[PDB]
Design a protein around this nucleic acid. Structure first.
Lengths: 235, 126, 136, 37, 176, 133, 192, 23
RNA sequence: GCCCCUAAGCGUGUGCUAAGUGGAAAAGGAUGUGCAGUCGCGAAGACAACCAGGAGGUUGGCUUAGAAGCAGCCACCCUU
RNA sequence: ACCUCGAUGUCGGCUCGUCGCAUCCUGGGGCUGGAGCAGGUCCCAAGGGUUGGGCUGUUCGCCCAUUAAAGCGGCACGCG
């Protein structure tokens, strides 16, 4: 199923974190899904995905995984090895930690050493890690500045209230568009299976009706950017 | 499709004929609602207009002297009930006859007299 | 699930599945109902599983009545043991059903969605059953 | 084709017929066509 | 039965023959021969028509009513005016040529394929990308055109292959 | 035969409006300049514009009365439409106000009478639940 | 109201019991017994089809005019017995009445209307017993519920009875209860 | 269990009257 | 039990079955056929084929980019 | 606990087979979120084929090299 849905051009982002980190409600509040939650342990278990939406008008694959617990046996890690395959299939990995706690250094240390186990045994480059503190309304401002100084890649969020969601899309935007390869293609007149593709599948830069054809400066996704290299304007 | 609704139609159509003087009957087919909305504003200013069933007309025509259109009830029936002067609605429709040219007049009736298509043109001329 | 709070006797005989129903053969709370046509021991799981099925098709409004309650216990001894030496502990609670008994009842504005909701629950019961109305 | 004991019309353009002693559903959409057995 | 109610109108240009249930019609194109089912009987009225007669309302006899009427109907409009079907071929590099009583296709295969002409069926090429099949028997004309149309596995991505005249085939977008 | 509704003084973003009709082969820039030139007088609404297309790709665009679904909002003072009409009422509009909306909507509505148009606005008022008193 | 009594024929049975009754229902009849102030029960059998047609139109309480052996006899169907599975009449009780007597009869209650959108109408009492003249029984009673707000109770005393009839049952009995629309979580909470 | 079924189902014949030894 | 093996009926009358059902089986799926009763419609032409329309407010309100007559929720009225 | 206790020799391996199809390869197709290459799922099909080694008594399993494939079962858990 993934081997037929990876062929498409949908960016994939993964949300991971401890149990009762509010990862389920983050997907509910960012999209509008009615995924049910319980203020207890193992609120959600199935690997849930739904569409993601943006400020600039881009869809992506937003994947909710299973919640972790501390001192997990590797037997249970292997038991849920089916739910954690999306970790390496993620363009961007979003990490959410308990913002009301004492030791954000331990929360990142435990999960990252858990996830990099799978990255190492799957031998792919680790994704750009992003941390999201939750419950800024239920958190103390002293620790807010401590992670401000320590992690510039950290962002304050309170999904239970909804502050700073527009900045999340901007941060999500700059790091997802960054994997694409800008192209300068010249599509001829006998390949008219591309005019709608360059306008909606990718991002347009400029367009001119030259003699050799239409010199289409454009930005297109990874399976769509290494793809027009035949008609490249320079080496 | 209970018969009571059709029975009320037969009484009403005849009573409007006996309340009106003349008629002009054309083909309604192929005319947009935008045209139908445009015409109904001009149609209802003085006259009235309906698109009823041929047999509903016949059972609502046998009472009074509007049985002089039996052989002409074959085709798309579009009654333009002109109540006042018979030339008002006949002049407006001849505007639409030239405006559209997809409408062809089937016939008309006035003063208990049976006419033809060319006679109707003269009626719109009178 | 539905279980009784306390039952005077914990290990009872098997309920007799003979004869036709003599009570509860008329819908008396809602508008539509399910009428049984075969004897069965409808456990508390099939009662609750069918209850969710009706709710998931109306999803907004209406009330569901369950006139049947799993009172009787049914026991089983541990597997891979020879016969004799006692009687097993009660495991699943069932409710005796005789044909003619009205099992579930629904109250919903439009009939088509009401009957389709009931047909969803009927397909989760161990019996043949039909849909009966409030009217005569 | 879907070989199922329980073939039903799925869309509003699905016709259910009999062809050589088998109940089958035939539709414009190839996804819908199915036979009994 | 409503289909079989009306009678087949014979024209001035053919002669019919009814010897029991072996009805044969001959005219300006050919000679066609037919046999009907045993309940049904067929004769002709003196007003230039052929009539099929079912004596019962049994399910078997009611189905053979409509079947017999259309068969004689096509037996008449065939032996006199005949049938033609206009076939088209689509895709770059796809052509057709005529080799006497045969047809040669070029449908992207390594080997140019041949289609023989069954008797009473005449191939008539018009343009390299459009042709027509004509004949006397409606059953045979539609049979060979069906084989012709199936010379390429269906392609909904670009529609390459032999199609019918006013076809609107199902297509889809082949993206990735 | 296409349709659009664009903000008063702003236009040409890429998702909403530009490629929304540039996929059919019409003008992209003069339409925005012309659209601004006509609405600068009104400037306080949204307009359903109905561009009618022919073989020659040249546009024929017309400007209609502001929608009753939004002309009611400015008449009542609220900004967000009601999520539960007939259960919680959030806007106030007087029968006089409906007459005021009918005066603006007198040109492009099917209503033959002033009071009949008032009914039409009342019929639209029920779709978001705006109190008519 | 002037309820036209129905004409039904009857025969007097030669034999009774379960042997004779089962044969009657197989042959196409339906047994019944006529009693009342006459103090002499007559065992009759009606035509099964005709009696059902009378019941299908004029409700359960249908005034009957039996011509038993050619003699007129006004009667009122006191009670019915229906098999719960096959839904057929097995037996009927026919009480003998004469014009100008106040009987006590249970009649059904209908509900007509369309309440405000945030409510669900749950009818409690299917029937209600009234006192009416022998030939002027109301065949059904109506409770038009419309424009009612959150939960409102319509008892028997809110029913508009026709002229010359009385509400025997106490007016405190509740008939129609309109309740707020159950919430999407209430379906989950109720019954577990 | 074909053997166990074909033997029990042998009792529905005319000459056995719905009963047989060992069912 | 009565076509031949195999003693005695390829018995008589009225219907049903097309599956070798007769000569194994369930939940359930299903335009296979015979019988009985109902309901809506219809020579004021109901149904099938076919002609012509199938519009205005409008992009009905909340919701995310967005549901614009046509993922989701509420409302679901009016003029020709 | 019905046949066998005045005997019905019990696991693996070797030799030798024979059958079923609920098919691992080869053969024919329908659907596909099937562009191609390659797949996924279902239907038809028993003609032939289905390797050699390290560890363990091992069936089973893990591993090393390959191959079009290294099928699942029954026959006293076939065969003293």
């Amino acid at each position: 199923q993934r081997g037929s849905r990876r062929r498409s051009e949908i960016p994939s982002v993964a949300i991971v974190g401890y149990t009762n980190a509010g990862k389920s409600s983050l997907l509910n509040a960012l999209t509008g899904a009615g995924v049910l939650v319980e203020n207890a342990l193992f609120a959600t278990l199935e690997p849930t995905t739904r569409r993601g939406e943006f400020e600039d008008g881009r869809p992506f694959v937003l994947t909710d995984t299973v919640g972790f617990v501390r001192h997990l046996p590797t037997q249970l890690v292997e038991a849920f090895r089916s739910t954690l395959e999306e970790v390496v299939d993620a363009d961007l990995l979003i990490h959410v930690v308990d913002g009301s706690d004492v030791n954000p250094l331990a929360q990142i240390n435990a999960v990252r050493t858990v996830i990099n186990e799978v990255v190492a045994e799957y031998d792919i480059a680790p994704p750009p890690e992003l941390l999201v503190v939750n419950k800024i309304d239920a958190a103390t401002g002293v620790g807010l500045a401590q992670l401000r100084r320590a992690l510039p890649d950290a962002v304050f969020v309170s999904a239970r209230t909804g502050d700073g969601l527009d900045k999340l899309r901007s941060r999500m935007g700059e790091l997802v568009e960054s994997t694409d390869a800008t192209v300068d293609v010249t599509i001829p007149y006998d390949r008219g299976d591309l005019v709608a593709r360059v306008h909606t599948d990718g991002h347009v830069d400029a367009t001119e009706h030259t003699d050799a054809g239409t010199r289409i400066k454009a930005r297109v996704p990874a399976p769509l950017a290494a793809t027009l290299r035949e008609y490249a304007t320079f080496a | 499709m209970a018969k009571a609704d059709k029975a009320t139609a037969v009484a009403d159509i005849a009573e409007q004929f006996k309340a009106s003087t003349a008629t002009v009957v054309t083909e309604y087919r192929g005319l947009t609602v935008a045209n139908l909305a445009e015409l109904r504003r001009a149609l209802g200013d003085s006259a009235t207009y309906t698109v009823a069933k041929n047999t509903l007309v016949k059972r609502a025509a046998s009472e009074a002297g509007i049985e002089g259109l039996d052989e002409l009830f074959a085709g798309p029936t579009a009654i333009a009930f002109v109540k006042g002067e018979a030339v008002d609605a006949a002049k407006a429709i001849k505007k639409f006859a030239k405006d559209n040219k997809a409408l062809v007049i089937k016939g008309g009736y006035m003063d208990g007299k049976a006419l033809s298509v060319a006679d109707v043109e003269k009626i719109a001329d009178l | 699930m539905l279980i009784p709070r306390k039952v005077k006797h914990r290990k009872q005989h098997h309920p007799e599945q003979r004869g036709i129903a003599s009570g509860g053969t008329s819908v008396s709370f809602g508008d539509y109902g399910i009428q049984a046509l075969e004897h069965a021991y409808i456990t508390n799981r099939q009662i609750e599983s069918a209850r969710i099925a009706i709710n998931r098709h109306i999803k907004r409004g209406g009330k569901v009545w369950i006139n049947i309650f799993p009172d009787r216990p049914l026991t089983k001894k541990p597997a891979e043991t020879r016969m004799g030496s006692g009687k097993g502990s009660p495991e699943w609670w069932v409710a005796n059903v005789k044909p003619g008994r009205v099992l579930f009842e629904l109250s919903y504005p439009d009939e088509k969605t009401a009957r389709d909701a009931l047909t969803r629950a009927i397909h989760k019961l161990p019996i043949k059953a039909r849909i009966v109305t409030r009217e005569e | 084709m879907k070989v199922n004991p329980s073939v039903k019309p799925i869309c509003d353009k699905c016709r259910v017929i009999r062809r050589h002693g088998r109940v089958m559903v035939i539709c414009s959409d190839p996804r819908h066509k199915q036979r009994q057995g | 039965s409503r289909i079989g109610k009306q009678p087949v109108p014979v024209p001035s240009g053919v002669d019919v023959t009814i010897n029991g249930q072996n009805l044969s019609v001959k005219g300006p194109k050919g000679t066609l021969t037919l046999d009907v089912a045993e309940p049904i009987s067929v004769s002709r009225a003196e007003d230039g028509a052929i009539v099929v007669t079912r004596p019962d309302d049994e399910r078997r006899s009611r189905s053979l009513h409509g079947l017999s009427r259309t068969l004689i109907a096509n037996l008449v409009t065939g032996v006199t005016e005949g049938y033609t079907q206009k076939m088209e071929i689509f895709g770059v590099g796809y052509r057709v040529q005529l080799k006497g009583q045969n047809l040669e296709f070029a449908l992207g295969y390594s080997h140019p394929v041949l289609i023989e002409a069954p008797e009473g069926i005449t191939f008539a090429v018009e343009s390299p990308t459009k042709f027509s099949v004509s004949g006397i028997d409606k059953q045979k004309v539609g049979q060979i055109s069906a084989v012709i149309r199936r010379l390429r596995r269906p392609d909904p991505y670009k529609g390459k292959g032999v199609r019918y005249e006013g076809e609107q085939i199902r297509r889809k977008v082949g993206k990735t | 035969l296409i349709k659009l509704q664009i903000q008063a003084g702003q236009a040409n973003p890429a998702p909403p409006v530009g490629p929304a009709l540039g996929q059919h082969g019409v003008n992209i820039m003069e339409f925005c300049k012309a659209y601004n030139a006509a609405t600068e007088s009104q400037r306080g609404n949204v307009i359903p514009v109905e561009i009618t297309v022919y073989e020659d790709r040249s546009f024929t665009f017309a400007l209609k009365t502001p929608p009753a679904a939004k002309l009611l909002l400015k008449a009542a003072g609220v900004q967000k439409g009601s999520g539960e009409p007939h259960k919680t009422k959030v806007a106030k509009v007087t029968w006089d106000q409906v007459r005021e909306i009918a005066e603006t909507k007198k040109a492009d509505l099917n209503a033959n009478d002033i009071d009949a148009a008032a009914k039409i606005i009342a019929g639209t008022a029920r779709s978001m639940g705006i109190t008519v008193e | 109201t002037a309820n036209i009594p129905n004409k039904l024929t009857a025969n007097v049975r030669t034999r009774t019991g379960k042997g004779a009754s089962r044969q009657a229902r197989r042959d196409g009849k339906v047994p019944a017994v006529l009693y009342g102030h006459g103090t002499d029960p007559q065992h009759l059998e009606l035509n099964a089809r005709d009696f059902a047609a009378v019941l299908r139109s004029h409700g359960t309480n249908a005034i009957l005019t039996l011509d038993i052996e050619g003699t007129e006899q006004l009667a009122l169907t006191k009670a019915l017995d229906v098999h719960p599975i096959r839904r057929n009449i097995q037996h009927a009780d026919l009480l003998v009445v004469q014009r100008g007597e106040k009987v006590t009869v249970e009649v059904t209650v209908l509900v007509e209307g369309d309440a405000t959108p945030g409510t669900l109408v749950t009818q409690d009492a299917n029937t209600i017993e009234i006192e009416a003249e022998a030939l002027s029984i109301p065949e059904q009673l109506t409770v038009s519920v419309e424009g009612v707000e959150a939960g409102t109770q319509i008892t028997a005393g809110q029913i508009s009875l026709p002229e010359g009839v009385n509400l025997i049952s106490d007016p405190e009995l509740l008939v129609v209860n309109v309740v707020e629309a159950p919430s999407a979580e209430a379906l989950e909470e109720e019954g577990a | 269990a074909k053997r166990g079924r074909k033997k029990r189902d042998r009792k529905h014949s005319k000459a056995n009257h719905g009963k047989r030894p060992n069912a």
